[PDB]
């Protein structure tokens, strides 16, 4: 009749195999230091 819209170990494994700030600082640092 009607529709409503309302609001661990895997984590450590992806870090080992490769933070949002880390990947944004590396991008920022690369283009400047050289």
């Amino acid at each position: 009749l009607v529709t409503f819209i309302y609001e661990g170990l895997p984590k450590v494994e992806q870090v080992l195999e490769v933070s949002l700030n880390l990947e944004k600082r590396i991008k920022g640092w690369n283009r400047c230091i050289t």
């Binding site: 700030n21 640092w29 400047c32």
Partner: peptide, 21 residues
């Protein structure tokens, strides 16, 4: 965190003894 500003990052590395002149 090391600041995104390159010269602030250089100063941080000098203070954290990562790299110096």
């Amino acid at each position: 965190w090391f600041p995104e500003e390159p010269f602030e990052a250089f100063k941080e590395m000098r203070e954290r003894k990562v790299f110096d002149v």
